[PDB]
Amino acid sequence: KLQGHDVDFLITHPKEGQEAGLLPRVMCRLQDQGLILYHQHQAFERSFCIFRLPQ
DNA sequence: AAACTATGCATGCTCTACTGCTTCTGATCTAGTCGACT
Numbered sequence: 480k481l482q483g484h485d486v487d488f489l490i491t492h493p494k495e496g497q498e499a500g501l502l503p504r505v506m507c508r509l510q511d512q513g514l515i516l517y518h519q520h521q522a523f524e525r526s527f528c529i530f531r532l533p534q
Numbered sequence: 535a536a537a538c539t540a541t542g543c544a545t546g547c548t549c550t551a552c553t554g555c556t557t558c559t560g561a562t563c564t565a566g567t568c569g570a571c572t
């Protein structure tokens with residue numbers, strides 16, 4: 480599709496047991512970036528947000 | 535010798551603290567129902 484309403488991403492790791500708590504860490508890092516306007520929650524394995532992309 | 539006064543004591547009353555037991559109340563964890571989303 481050349482258009483849409485959101486960007487859907489999936490995060491995975493080649494190892495088995497490593498994928499334990501990636502999403503909270505990435506979420507916190509992005510929040511520290513200063514791009515998240517809304518967060519679903521503000522252990523989890525899913526979250527939809529509203530990024531602030533530069534324009 | 536008799537009348538008045540003095541001390542002395544006891545017991546019930548009141549208050550304030552103190553400790554320990556019992557009951558009531560406020561803070562903290564989950565089932566169900568409705569709704570949101572991918």
Ligand SMILES: Nc1ncnc2c1ncn2[C@H]1C[C@H](O)[C@@H](COP(=O)(O)NP(=O)(O)OP(=O)(O)O)O1
Nearest residue numbers: 480481482483484485486487488489527528571572
């Ligand atoms: N009710 C549902 N049931 C099963 N899978 C679903 C679903 N709703 C979404 N998915 C799954 C399948 C969907 O492909 C995937 C993406 O969800 P979106 O971002 O909400 N819808 P899309 O990306 O297709 O349209 P756009 O490009 O405009 O955003 O999530």
Ligand SMILES: [Mg+2]
Nearest residue numbers: 483485486487
């Ligand atoms: Mg989508």
Ligand SMILES: [Mg+2]
Nearest residue numbers: 485486487572
């Ligand atoms: Mg989506």
